[PDB]
mmCIF file of C-alpha atoms in Angstrom:
data_model
loop_
_atom_site.group_PDB
_atom_site.id
_atom_site.type_symbol
_atom_site.label_atom_id
_atom_site.label_comp_id
_atom_site.label_asym_id
_atom_site.label_seq_id
_atom_site.Cartn_x
_atom_site.Cartn_y
_atom_site.Cartn_z
ATOM 1 C CA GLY W 1 91.699 75.979 94.115
ATOM 2 C CA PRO W 2 95.381 76.202 95.891
ATOM 3 C CA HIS W 3 97.489 76.582 92.463
ATOM 4 C CA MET W 4 97.468 79.306 90.187
ATOM 5 C CA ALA W 5 95.495 78.988 86.723
ATOM 6 C CA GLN W 6 96.681 78.070 83.309
ATOM 7 C CA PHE W 7 96.119 82.632 82.307
ATOM 8 C CA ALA W 8 96.192 83.362 78.197
ATOM 9 C CA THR W 9 99.028 85.511 77.824
ATOM 10 C CA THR W 10 97.952 89.071 76.859
ATOM 11 C CA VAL W 11 99.334 92.835 76.028
ATOM 12 C CA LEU W 12 97.623 95.968 78.047
ATOM 13 C CA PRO W 13 95.385 96.759 75.007
ATOM 14 C CA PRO W 14 95.880 101.282 73.142
ATOM 15 C CA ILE W 15 94.347 103.700 75.571
ATOM 16 C CA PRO W 16 90.682 103.770 73.942
ATOM 17 C CA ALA W 17 89.017 106.163 71.477
ATOM 18 C CA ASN W 18 85.677 105.501 73.083
ATOM 19 C CA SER W 19 82.983 104.135 75.284
ATOM 20 C CA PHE W 20 82.354 101.221 72.720
ATOM 21 C CA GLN W 21 85.520 100.107 73.321
ATOM 22 C CA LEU W 22 86.977 101.055 76.465
ATOM 23 C CA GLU W 23 83.770 98.101 77.456
ATOM 24 C CA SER W 24 84.919 95.551 75.187
ATOM 25 C CA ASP W 25 88.404 95.711 77.476
ATOM 26 C CA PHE W 26 86.891 95.541 80.678
ATOM 27 C CA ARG W 27 85.258 92.766 79.495
ATOM 28 C CA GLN W 28 88.193 91.225 78.120
ATOM 29 C CA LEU W 29 90.219 91.634 81.062
ATOM 30 C CA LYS W 30 87.279 91.810 84.185
ATOM 31 C CA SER W 31 89.191 88.459 84.890
ATOM 32 C CA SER W 32 93.038 89.757 84.865
ATOM 33 C CA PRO W 33 92.397 93.411 88.083
ATOM 34 C CA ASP W 34 96.308 93.154 88.521
ATOM 35 C CA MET W 35 96.122 94.457 84.250
ATOM 36 C CA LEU W 36 93.362 96.041 84.711
ATOM 37 C CA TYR W 37 95.204 98.633 87.467
ATOM 38 C CA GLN W 38 97.955 98.915 85.147
ATOM 39 C CA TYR W 39 95.563 99.301 81.845
ATOM 40 C CA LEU W 40 93.280 102.491 84.321
ATOM 41 C CA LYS W 41 96.883 103.627 84.855
ATOM 42 C CA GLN W 42 97.277 104.716 81.051
ATOM 43 C CA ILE W 43 93.594 106.463 81.550
ATOM 44 C CA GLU W 44 93.856 110.458 82.682
ATOM 45 C CA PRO W 45 91.079 111.519 84.498
ATOM 46 C CA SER W 46 90.371 114.054 81.071
ATOM 47 C CA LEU W 47 88.952 111.389 79.325
ATOM 48 C CA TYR W 48 86.039 109.282 81.874
ATOM 49 C CA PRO W 49 83.582 112.724 80.739
ATOM 50 C CA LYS W 50 84.870 112.486 76.977
ATOM 51 C CA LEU W 51 84.616 108.539 76.445
ATOM 52 C CA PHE W 52 81.049 108.286 78.747
ATOM 53 C CA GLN W 53 79.824 110.909 76.691
ATOM 54 C CA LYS W 54 77.034 109.381 74.879
ATOM 55 C CA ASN W 55 76.726 106.051 77.659
ATOM 56 C CA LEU W 56 78.639 104.656 80.744
ATOM 57 C CA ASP W 57 77.557 101.583 81.730
ATOM 58 C CA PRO W 58 76.538 99.351 84.413
ATOM 59 C CA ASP W 59 79.542 96.187 84.601
ATOM 60 C CA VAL W 60 82.026 98.887 83.194
ATOM 61 C CA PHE W 61 80.912 101.138 86.760
ATOM 62 C CA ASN W 62 81.647 97.764 89.053
ATOM 63 C CA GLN W 63 85.131 97.358 87.284
ATOM 64 C CA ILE W 64 87.013 100.781 87.615
ATOM 65 C CA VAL W 65 85.738 101.004 91.338
ATOM 66 C CA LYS W 66 86.704 97.157 92.073
ATOM 67 C CA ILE W 67 89.984 98.014 90.595
ATOM 68 C CA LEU W 68 90.290 101.437 93.192
ATOM 69 C CA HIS W 69 89.331 98.931 95.318
ATOM 70 C CA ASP W 70 92.185 96.755 96.053
ATOM 71 C CA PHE W 71 95.143 98.340 94.021
ATOM 72 C CA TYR W 72 94.075 102.781 93.762
ATOM 73 C CA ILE W 73 93.808 101.605 97.775
ATOM 74 C CA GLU W 74 97.717 100.234 97.906
ATOM 75 C CA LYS W 75 99.837 101.163 94.718
ATOM 76 C CA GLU W 76 98.443 105.495 93.920
ATOM 77 C CA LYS W 77 97.408 107.783 95.937
ATOM 78 C CA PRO W 78 94.085 107.902 98.205
ATOM 79 C CA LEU W 79 93.674 112.120 95.586
ATOM 80 C CA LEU W 80 93.296 110.236 92.138
ATOM 81 C CA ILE W 81 90.819 107.276 93.428
ATOM 82 C CA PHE W 82 88.418 110.035 94.756
ATOM 83 C CA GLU W 83 88.958 112.487 91.062
ATOM 84 C CA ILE W 84 87.899 109.461 89.263
ATOM 85 C CA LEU W 85 85.015 108.783 91.131
ATOM 86 C CA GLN W 86 84.236 112.133 90.350
ATOM 87 C CA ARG W 87 84.077 111.850 86.441
ATOM 88 C CA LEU W 88 81.572 109.751 86.992
ATOM 89 C CA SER W 89 79.564 111.172 88.866
ATOM 90 C CA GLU W 90 78.724 113.705 86.125
ATOM 91 C CA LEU W 91 77.715 111.267 83.383
ATOM 92 C CA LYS W 92 73.944 110.900 82.466
ATOM 93 C CA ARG W 93 73.392 107.307 82.887
ATOM 94 C CA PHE W 94 75.931 107.195 86.523
ATOM 95 C CA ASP W 95 72.923 106.636 88.519
ATOM 96 C CA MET W 96 71.179 104.196 86.329
ATOM 97 C CA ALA W 97 74.892 102.382 86.630
ATOM 98 C CA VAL W 98 74.362 102.565 90.797
ATOM 99 C CA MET W 99 70.846 101.488 90.282
ATOM 100 C CA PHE W 100 71.871 97.850 88.475
ATOM 101 C CA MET W 101 74.455 97.500 91.333
ATOM 102 C CA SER W 102 74.264 94.675 94.303
ATOM 103 C CA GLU W 103 75.080 95.401 98.105
ATOM 104 C CA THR W 104 79.258 93.476 96.784
ATOM 105 C CA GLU W 105 79.389 96.395 94.573
ATOM 106 C CA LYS W 106 77.888 98.884 97.381
ATOM 107 C CA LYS W 107 80.097 97.801 100.096
ATOM 108 C CA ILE W 108 82.860 97.766 97.601
ATOM 109 C CA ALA W 109 81.308 101.447 96.860
ATOM 110 C CA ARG W 110 81.982 103.304 100.029
ATOM 111 C CA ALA W 111 85.010 101.243 101.568
ATOM 112 C CA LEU W 112 87.309 103.556 98.656
ATOM 113 C CA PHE W 113 85.293 106.855 100.566
ATOM 114 C CA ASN W 114 86.164 105.681 103.777
ATOM 115 C CA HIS W 115 89.539 105.586 102.938
ATOM 116 C CA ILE W 116 89.495 108.867 101.096
ATOM 117 C CA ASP W 117 88.507 109.964 104.681
ATOM 118 C CA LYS W 118 90.731 108.594 106.736
ATOM 119 C CA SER W 119 93.722 109.483 104.215
ATOM 120 C CA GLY W 120 93.362 113.404 105.652
ATOM 121 C CA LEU W 121 90.998 114.415 102.257
ATOM 122 C CA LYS W 122 87.792 115.664 104.205
ATOM 123 C CA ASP W 123 84.900 118.058 101.562
ATOM 124 C CA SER W 124 81.431 118.205 101.217
ATOM 125 C CA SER W 125 81.904 116.376 97.657
ATOM 126 C CA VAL W 126 83.628 113.355 99.570
ATOM 127 C CA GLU W 127 80.033 112.545 102.179
ATOM 128 C CA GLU W 128 77.958 113.452 98.255
ATOM 129 C CA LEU W 129 80.112 110.829 96.331
ATOM 130 C CA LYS W 130 79.380 108.039 98.554
ATOM 131 C CA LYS W 131 75.917 108.254 98.667
ATOM 132 C CA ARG W 132 75.726 109.326 95.360
ATOM 133 C CA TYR W 133 76.975 106.083 94.984
ATOM 134 C CA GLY W 134 76.205 103.891 97.434
ATOM 135 C CA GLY W 135 74.738 105.936 100.803
#
């Protein structure tokens, strides 16, 4: 409504050991995207291929993208969004996560590559990774 609701008292959880632990912390914070940004800030791109090595989740795939869209574009560097999206593209389930996305998640995914491009970042991987997520 026109006012802010009462939110529960919560604190950014530690960095997870594997995807089972990551998706648990994503699905509990999905309604708190402003702390999801700060939870993402703990996680380095070197953990992305290792957490998700046995599988990804389609809801985690769209949540990573959905937090990059409204926070890493404003608060972090355009290069960081691009590196995060690249780590996920090497996952064995990533294209099944794209298959479970709708137009509403794909318009967010391209809006990342649209901001990265206009920020001055030009590589063949920019236009490849945009088509892998929503071309």
